[PDB]
Design a protein around this ligand. Sequence first.
Ligand SMILES: CCN1CC[C@H](Oc2ccc([C@@H]3c4ccc(O)cc4CC4(CC4)N3C(=O)c3ccccc3)cc2)C1
Ligand SMILES: CCN1CC[C@H](Oc2ccc([C@@H]3c4ccc(O)cc4CC4(CC4)N3C(=O)c3ccccc3)cc2)C1
Lengths: 218, 228
Amino acid sequence: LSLTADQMVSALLDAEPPILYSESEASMMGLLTNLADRELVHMINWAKRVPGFVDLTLHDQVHLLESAWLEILMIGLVWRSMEHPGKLLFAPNLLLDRNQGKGMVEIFDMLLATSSRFRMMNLQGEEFVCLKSIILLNSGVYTFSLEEKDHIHRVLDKITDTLIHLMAKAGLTLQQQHQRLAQLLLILSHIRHMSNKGMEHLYSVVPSYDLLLEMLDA
Amino acid sequence: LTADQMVSALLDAEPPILYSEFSEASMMGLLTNLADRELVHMINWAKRVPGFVDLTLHDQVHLLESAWLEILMIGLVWRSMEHPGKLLFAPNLLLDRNQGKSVEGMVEIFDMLLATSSRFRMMNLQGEEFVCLKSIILLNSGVYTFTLKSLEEKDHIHRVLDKITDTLIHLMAKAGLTLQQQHQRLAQLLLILSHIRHMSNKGMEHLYSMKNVVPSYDLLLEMLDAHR
Ligand SMILES: CCN1CC[C@H](Oc2ccc([C@@H]3c4ccc(O)cc4CC4(CC4)N3C(=O)c3ccccc3)cc2)C1
Ligand SMILES: CCN1CC[C@H](Oc2ccc([C@@H]3c4ccc(O)cc4CC4(CC4)N3C(=O)c3ccccc3)cc2)C1
């Protein structure tokens, strides 16, 4: 909460998790499930390095991860796929196009369109890691103590300050800084929608509290 | 449009507060009837949101198909803002969460609505901010799920969303917030739109679990597609 915007960016950039590799349709879904399961462990490690996260109770950290993990998996997929129009880069050895998706193809198309939007806004890495932290802190805050929510709101305020700082350094006018901040946060409501539809697809499943708690390694 | 002209147009577009036409058995019937009547006024409101009628009728329908439940829910939260623990579906239909326990799955959504109302209250959300947020929902909700014409439409929607951002900022500056406070408040408002998107998805699931579940394409087209 005392970190400068430069130090917040550096912390987030240093916390970035690694890109993992993948290990017919049936084998395709098994591969994707296994990849997501391995990514989750790295996601927990990443979350523990987001400044402010571990000041929350363990119970609240678990709730935030429960609400956010699918959104975080999807935004990372969208980021990896930016430079690959029309395809989704699940892993460096697992690049799929829309035809391989043929309720899969509707979510596949939403993800491709998000990656398209990122590509047209020329989303930067520094902006991406702030967006990912906002998903972690924002997604479960409405659905939980009041001190905990205050702390989460103070951290979100710091990430907003950091996003604005990055845009100012890139030379954006104040008007362009506000407009870009808004454009980026409006994409998060589309990522929320995808995660909701993504969950509906998966149930047609979630990591348990105990599993998340164990990976947090109190 | 200037920011002040944008606010004025949105305030003048605001639909009226409707009334319900009581027992737990009749509750879903009253709510359905109320929402059906609200949808008609929502259509008239959307046509008055600057830039909306520049779109094709097809795209207008698609935005309303994406956004209509979010828009009903945000109005409900706004009407309930000053009534802690209650949802003011209508001035004569004010429910608490024990009344939501009647239908399976209802209390979960009721609690999400109550938490949003509580958040609006904690932020002291102003009416001018509210109408901006509702217009953002209409323009943003269906834009990621829409070809030369499509590119032109998306560019136009993003330009109108940028104008509403400038309007939100102007409202906060004219009220004397600092630049830091302006950016922080803008972010806090827009992040609430993710929760509203979440509530609308859970709500749609709830509506299908009961099962005329949504306004059809042609119904929306019919109401949007007016003659002269
Ligand atoms: C941790 C929870 N359990 C373990 C995993 C199970 O959930 C899963 C979670 C994620 C996926 C993949 C996956 C993998 C890696 C990634 O980076 C991202 C994704 C994205 C994603 C979610 C949309 N997905 C799909 O397949 C998909 C993509 C396009 C259209 C339709 C579907 C599979 C299963 C339960
Ligand atoms: C236009 C479509 N038809 C309309 C009827 C069908 O959709 C409907 C749309 C809305 C509702 C109400 C309703 C009414 C007015 C309002 O301002 C807001 C709402 C909100 C709401 C949606 C969550 N709701 C519920 O009951 C509810 C409230 C609390 C918890 C769980 C459920 C009923 C039915 C198809």
